[PDB]
Amino acid sequence: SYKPVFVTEITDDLHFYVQDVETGTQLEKLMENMRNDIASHPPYAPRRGEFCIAKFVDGEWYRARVEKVESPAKIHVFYIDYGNREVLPSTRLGTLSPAFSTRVLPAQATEYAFAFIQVPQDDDARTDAVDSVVRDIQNTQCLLNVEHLSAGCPHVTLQFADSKGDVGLGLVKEGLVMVEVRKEKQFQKVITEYLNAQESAKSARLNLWRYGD
Amino acid sequence: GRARGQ
């Protein structure tokens, strides 16, 4: 059962943040109400671990968490509803009012990784894979299915909204990533399909397999 | 506007 999500950020480690489309309206409303409240209560003592508001590069305020105070000019924040990080001065920080807390609406961005694929260890190969995914899915609406948990973030399959093509499988087909085998019996059909695409990618001498195997 | 102008 695939659910619609909006992909916000792709990380250099081939993880990615998504927002649930079903709650997009609620996020929009919260932001509208938060900003109306900020406009009347113009910007707090930033400290590590604390929630705040932070003024992004579009000139708008968003919900954030303080991760590191490097100096008064360099406060490291994480935008809880989008997943991007930013270093900013104190002039771009404010109090997050209780009316807009994560109890009122949960953090809207969730970190995921692709199921059944290995993130390339070679730096340039990993860049090629990241770059593909950025071009194809960053800031677009996709379909998502949670496959399995891990000692880390959950792993998922994504589908393109239009073609319904499996995104991670696309990477394997292109020879941009290798397959990550799992033992669960319910994953055997999909893993066999991924291994089949990988072998075909190897025979076509694409990307990772350009010079053979 | 989901891309935030980006």
GROMACS .gro file of N, CA and C in nm, chain A residues 35-137:
model
  309
   35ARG      N    1   0.310   3.243   1.100
   35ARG     CA    2   0.370   3.364   1.041
   35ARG      C    3   0.289   3.488   1.071
   36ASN      N    4   0.158   3.471   1.077
   36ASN     CA    5   0.069   3.578   1.117
   36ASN      C    6   0.097   3.619   1.261
   37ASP      N    7   0.127   3.521   1.345
   37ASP     CA    8   0.161   3.545   1.484
   37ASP      C    9   0.299   3.608   1.499
   38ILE      N   10   0.393   3.569   1.412
   38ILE     CA   11   0.529   3.626   1.413
   38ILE      C   12   0.525   3.774   1.371
   39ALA      N   13   0.446   3.803   1.268
   39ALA     CA   14   0.429   3.940   1.219
   39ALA      C   15   0.383   4.038   1.328
   40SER      N   16   0.314   3.988   1.431
   40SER     CA   17   0.270   4.071   1.543
   40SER      C   18   0.358   4.057   1.668
   41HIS      N   19   0.441   3.954   1.672
   41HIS     CA   20   0.536   3.934   1.783
   41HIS      C   21   0.677   3.917   1.728
   42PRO      N   22   0.741   4.028   1.686
   42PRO     CA   23   0.871   4.025   1.618
   42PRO      C   24   0.987   3.979   1.708
   43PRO      N   25   1.064   3.877   1.663
   43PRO     CA   26   1.173   3.818   1.742
   43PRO      C   27   1.275   3.918   1.801
   44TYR      N   28   1.432   3.560   2.293
   44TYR     CA   29   1.474   3.422   2.274
   44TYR      C   30   1.624   3.405   2.297
   45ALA      N   31   1.659   3.298   2.367
   45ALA     CA   32   1.796   3.265   2.402
   45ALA      C   33   1.832   3.127   2.346
   46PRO      N   34   1.877   3.122   2.219
   46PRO     CA   35   1.902   2.992   2.154
   46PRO      C   36   1.995   2.902   2.234
   47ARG      N   37   1.950   2.780   2.262
   47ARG     CA   38   2.033   2.680   2.328
   47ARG      C   39   2.014   2.546   2.261
   48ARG      N   40   2.117   2.462   2.268
   48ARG     CA   41   2.118   2.330   2.207
   48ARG      C   42   2.000   2.242   2.252
   49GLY      N   43   1.938   2.175   2.154
   49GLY     CA   44   1.828   2.081   2.178
   49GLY      C   45   1.692   2.147   2.178
   50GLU      N   46   1.692   2.280   2.183
   50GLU     CA   47   1.572   2.358   2.197
   50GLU      C   48   1.505   2.375   2.062
   51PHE      N   49   1.372   2.374   2.061
   51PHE     CA   50   1.301   2.417   1.941
   51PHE      C   51   1.311   2.568   1.926
   52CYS      N   52   1.287   2.616   1.804
   52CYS     CA   53   1.283   2.759   1.775
   52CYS      C   54   1.208   2.781   1.644
   53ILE      N   55   1.196   2.907   1.606
   53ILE     CA   56   1.170   2.941   1.467
   53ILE      C   57   1.300   2.993   1.405
   54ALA      N   58   1.315   2.970   1.275
   54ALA     CA   59   1.433   3.010   1.200
   54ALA      C   60   1.390   3.066   1.065
   55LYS      N   61   1.454   3.177   1.025
   55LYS     CA   62   1.419   3.245   0.903
   55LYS      C   63   1.502   3.191   0.788
   56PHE      N   64   1.436   3.121   0.697
   56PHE     CA   65   1.501   3.055   0.582
   56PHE      C   66   1.533   3.156   0.471
   57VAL      N   67   1.594   3.109   0.362
   57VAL     CA   68   1.645   3.195   0.253
   57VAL      C   69   1.537   3.250   0.159
   58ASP      N   70   1.413   3.203   0.177
   58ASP     CA   71   1.296   3.258   0.109
   58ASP      C   72   1.236   3.371   0.193
   59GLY      N   73   1.303   3.405   0.304
   59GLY     CA   74   1.260   3.516   0.388
   59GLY      C   75   1.146   3.480   0.481
   60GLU      N   76   1.109   3.353   0.485
   60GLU     CA   77   0.998   3.306   0.568
   60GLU      C   78   1.051   3.233   0.690
   61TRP      N   79   0.975   3.241   0.798
   61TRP     CA   80   1.005   3.168   0.920
   61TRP      C   81   0.949   3.026   0.921
   62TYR      N   82   1.030   2.932   0.970
   62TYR     CA   83   0.990   2.790   0.980
   62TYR      C   84   1.024   2.733   1.116
   63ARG      N   85   0.965   2.617   1.147
   63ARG     CA   86   0.999   2.548   1.272
   63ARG      C   87   1.136   2.481   1.262
   64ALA      N   88   1.215   2.496   1.368
   64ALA     CA   89   1.348   2.436   1.370
   64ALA      C   90   1.389   2.386   1.509
   65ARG      N   91   1.498   2.311   1.510
   65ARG     CA   92   1.561   2.266   1.633
   65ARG      C   93   1.706   2.311   1.630
   66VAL      N   94   1.754   2.368   1.740
   66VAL     CA   95   1.894   2.406   1.755
   66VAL      C   96   1.978   2.281   1.779
   67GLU      N   97   2.075   2.257   1.692
   67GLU     CA   98   2.161   2.139   1.702
   67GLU      C   99   2.298   2.170   1.761
   68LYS      N  100   2.351   2.288   1.728
   68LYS     CA  101   2.483   2.333   1.776
   68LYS      C  102   2.491   2.486   1.771
   69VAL      N  103   2.536   2.546   1.882
   69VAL     CA  104   2.569   2.688   1.888
   69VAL      C  105   2.721   2.700   1.872
   70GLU      N  106   2.766   2.739   1.754
   70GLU     CA  107   2.908   2.751   1.728
   70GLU      C  108   2.962   2.884   1.778
   71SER      N  109   2.879   2.987   1.766
   71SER     CA  110   2.912   3.123   1.804
   71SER      C  111   2.783   3.201   1.787
   72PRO      N  112   2.778   3.325   1.839
   72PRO     CA  113   2.656   3.406   1.819
   72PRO      C  114   2.620   3.428   1.672
   73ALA      N  115   2.719   3.421   1.583
   73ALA     CA  116   2.694   3.438   1.440
   73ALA      C  117   2.666   3.305   1.368
   74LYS      N  118   2.691   3.194   1.437
   74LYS     CA  119   2.680   3.060   1.376
   74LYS      C  120   2.601   2.961   1.463
   75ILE      N  121   2.469   2.965   1.448
   75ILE     CA  122   2.383   2.868   1.513
   75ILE      C  123   2.329   2.768   1.411
   76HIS      N  124   2.364   2.642   1.434
   76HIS     CA  125   2.331   2.529   1.348
   76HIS      C  126   2.190   2.482   1.381
   77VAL      N  127   2.102   2.487   1.281
   77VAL     CA  128   1.963   2.445   1.301
   77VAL      C  129   1.923   2.336   1.203
   78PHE      N  130   1.816   2.266   1.239
   78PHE     CA  131   1.758   2.160   1.156
   78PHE      C  132   1.610   2.193   1.139
   79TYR      N  133   1.563   2.206   1.015
   79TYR     CA  134   1.425   2.248   0.989
   79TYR      C  135   1.339   2.125   0.995
   80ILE      N  136   1.262   2.113   1.104
   80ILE     CA  137   1.198   1.987   1.141
   80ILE      C  138   1.089   1.942   1.042
   81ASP      N  139   1.032   2.038   0.969
   81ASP     CA  140   0.928   2.004   0.871
   81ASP      C  141   0.978   1.978   0.728
   82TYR      N  142   1.107   2.004   0.703
   82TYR     CA  143   1.167   1.987   0.569
   82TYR      C  144   1.291   1.896   0.567
   83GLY      N  145   1.368   1.897   0.674
   83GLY     CA  146   1.486   1.812   0.682
   83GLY      C  147   1.618   1.873   0.641
   84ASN      N  148   1.617   1.997   0.593
   84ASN     CA  149   1.743   2.065   0.561
   84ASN      C  150   1.808   2.129   0.685
   85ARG      N  151   1.939   2.148   0.679
   85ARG     CA  152   2.011   2.213   0.788
   85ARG      C  153   2.074   2.342   0.739
   86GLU      N  154   2.101   2.432   0.833
   86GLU     CA  155   2.144   2.567   0.801
   86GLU      C  156   2.217   2.627   0.920
   87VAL      N  157   2.317   2.708   0.890
   87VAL     CA  158   2.392   2.780   0.992
   87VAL      C  159   2.352   2.925   0.982
   88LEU      N  160   2.306   2.983   1.091
   88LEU     CA  161   2.255   3.117   1.081
   88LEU      C  162   2.286   3.202   1.203
   89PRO      N  163   2.282   3.335   1.186
   89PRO     CA  164   2.306   3.425   1.297
   89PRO      C  165   2.182   3.437   1.383
   90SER      N  166   2.200   3.494   1.502
   90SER     CA  167   2.088   3.507   1.596
   90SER      C  168   1.975   3.599   1.548
   91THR      N  169   2.000   3.683   1.448
   91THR     CA  170   1.897   3.774   1.397
   91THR      C  171   1.791   3.695   1.321
   92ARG      N  172   1.821   3.569   1.288
   92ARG     CA  173   1.731   3.482   1.214
   92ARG      C  174   1.675   3.367   1.301
   93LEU      N  175   1.675   3.388   1.432
   93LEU     CA  176   1.618   3.293   1.527
   93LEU      C  177   1.514   3.360   1.616
   94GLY      N  178   1.413   3.283   1.657
   94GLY     CA  179   1.308   3.332   1.745
   94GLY      C  180   1.253   3.219   1.828
   95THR      N  181   1.165   3.252   1.922
   95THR     CA  182   1.098   3.152   2.006
   95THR      C  183   0.993   3.077   1.924
   96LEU      N  184   0.984   2.945   1.943
   96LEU     CA  185   0.869   2.874   1.889
   96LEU      C  186   0.760   2.876   1.995
   97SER      N  187   0.650   2.946   1.967
   97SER     CA  188   0.537   2.955   2.060
   97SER      C  189   0.476   2.817   2.084
   98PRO      N  190   0.424   2.792   2.207
   98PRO     CA  191   0.354   2.666   2.234
   98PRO      C  192   0.242   2.635   2.134
   99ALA      N  193   0.180   2.739   2.078
   99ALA     CA  194   0.068   2.720   1.985
   99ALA      C  195   0.107   2.645   1.856
  100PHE      N  196   0.238   2.639   1.830
  100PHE     CA  197   0.290   2.579   1.708
  100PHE      C  198   0.391   2.466   1.736
  101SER      N  199   0.379   2.405   1.854
  101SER     CA  200   0.473   2.301   1.897
  101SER      C  201   0.449   2.170   1.821
  102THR      N  202   0.540   2.075   1.839
  102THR     CA  203   0.528   1.944   1.775
  102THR      C  204   0.418   1.862   1.840
  103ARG      N  205   0.366   1.910   1.952
  103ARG     CA  206   0.248   1.849   2.012
  103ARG      C  207   0.121   1.891   1.935
  104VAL      N  208   0.119   2.015   1.888
  104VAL     CA  209   0.010   2.067   1.804
  104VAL      C  210   0.009   2.001   1.663
  105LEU      N  211   0.126   1.994   1.599
  105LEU     CA  212   0.144   1.919   1.474
  105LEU      C  213   0.284   1.858   1.475
  106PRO      N  214   0.294   1.726   1.452
  106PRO     CA  215   0.424   1.662   1.459
  106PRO      C  216   0.519   1.716   1.353
  107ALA      N  217   0.649   1.696   1.375
  107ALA     CA  218   0.751   1.730   1.275
  107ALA      C  219   0.711   1.662   1.144
  108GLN      N  220   0.710   1.737   1.034
  108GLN     CA  221   0.654   1.688   0.907
  108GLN      C  222   0.752   1.615   0.814
  109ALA      N  223   0.881   1.624   0.840
  109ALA     CA  224   0.980   1.557   0.756
  109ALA      C  225   1.024   1.430   0.826
  110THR      N  226   1.027   1.319   0.751
  110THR     CA  227   1.079   1.190   0.801
  110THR      C  228   1.198   1.143   0.717
  111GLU      N  229   1.305   1.100   0.785
  111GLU     CA  230   1.421   1.048   0.714
  111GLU      C  231   1.400   0.900   0.675
  112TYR      N  232   1.433   0.868   0.551
  112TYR     CA  233   1.428   0.732   0.502
  112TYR      C  234   1.550   0.700   0.418
  113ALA      N  235   1.570   0.572   0.390
  113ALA     CA  236   1.670   0.526   0.294
  113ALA      C  237   1.603   0.427   0.200
  114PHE      N  238   1.667   0.399   0.087
  114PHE     CA  239   1.613   0.300  -0.004
  114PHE      C  240   1.635   0.158   0.047
  115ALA      N  241   1.530   0.079   0.040
  115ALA     CA  242   1.540  -0.063   0.066
  115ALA      C  243   1.609  -0.137  -0.049
  116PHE      N  244   1.681  -0.243  -0.011
  116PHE     CA  245   1.738  -0.342  -0.104
  116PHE      C  246   1.850  -0.286  -0.191
  117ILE      N  247   1.903  -0.169  -0.155
  117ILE     CA  248   2.022  -0.117  -0.224
  117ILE      C  249   2.131  -0.078  -0.126
  118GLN      N  250   2.256  -0.092  -0.170
  118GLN     CA  251   2.372  -0.045  -0.095
  118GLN      C  252   2.406   0.097  -0.139
  119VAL      N  253   2.441   0.183  -0.044
  119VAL     CA  254   2.492   0.314  -0.078
  119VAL      C  255   2.637   0.290  -0.121
  120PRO      N  256   2.677   0.338  -0.240
  120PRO     CA  257   2.814   0.316  -0.287
  120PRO      C  258   2.920   0.373  -0.189
  121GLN      N  259   3.024   0.294  -0.161
  121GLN     CA  260   3.131   0.341  -0.072
  121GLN      C  261   3.228   0.436  -0.144
  122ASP      N  262   3.252   0.412  -0.273
  122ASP     CA  263   3.338   0.501  -0.349
  122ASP      C  264   3.272   0.639  -0.360
  123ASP      N  265   3.348   0.744  -0.327
  123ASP     CA  266   3.292   0.879  -0.321
  123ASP      C  267   3.228   0.924  -0.453
  124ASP      N  268   3.297   0.904  -0.565
  124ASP     CA  269   3.243   0.950  -0.693
  124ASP      C  270   3.120   0.870  -0.738
  125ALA      N  271   3.120   0.739  -0.713
  125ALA     CA  272   3.003   0.654  -0.743
  125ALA      C  273   2.883   0.695  -0.658
  126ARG      N  274   2.907   0.723  -0.530
  126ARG     CA  275   2.800   0.770  -0.443
  126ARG      C  276   2.744   0.905  -0.490
  127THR      N  277   2.832   0.997  -0.531
  127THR     CA  278   2.789   1.124  -0.589
  127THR      C  279   2.703   1.103  -0.712
  128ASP      N  280   2.742   1.011  -0.801
  128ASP     CA  281   2.662   0.980  -0.920
  128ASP      C  282   2.519   0.934  -0.884
  129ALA      N  283   2.509   0.843  -0.786
  129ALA     CA  284   2.381   0.793  -0.737
  129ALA      C  285   2.296   0.905  -0.673
  130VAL      N  286   2.356   0.983  -0.583
  130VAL     CA  287   2.287   1.097  -0.520
  130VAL      C  288   2.235   1.192  -0.627
  131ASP      N  289   2.323   1.227  -0.720
  131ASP     CA  290   2.290   1.320  -0.825
  131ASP      C  291   2.171   1.273  -0.909
  132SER      N  292   2.168   1.143  -0.943
  132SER     CA  293   2.053   1.084  -1.013
  132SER      C  294   1.923   1.105  -0.937
  133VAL      N  295   1.925   1.070  -0.810
  133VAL     CA  296   1.804   1.080  -0.728
  133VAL      C  297   1.761   1.227  -0.714
  134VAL      N  298   1.858   1.318  -0.700
  134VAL     CA  299   1.826   1.460  -0.685
  134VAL      C  300   1.749   1.507  -0.811
  135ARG      N  301   1.806   1.477  -0.928
  135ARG     CA  302   1.744   1.512  -1.056
  135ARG      C  303   1.604   1.455  -1.073
  136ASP      N  304   1.586   1.331  -1.028
  136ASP     CA  305   1.462   1.260  -1.054
  136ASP      C  306   1.351   1.280  -0.951
  137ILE      N  307   1.387   1.299  -0.824
  137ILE     CA  308   1.281   1.306  -0.722
  137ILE      C  309   1.285   1.428  -0.630
   0.00000   0.00000   0.00000
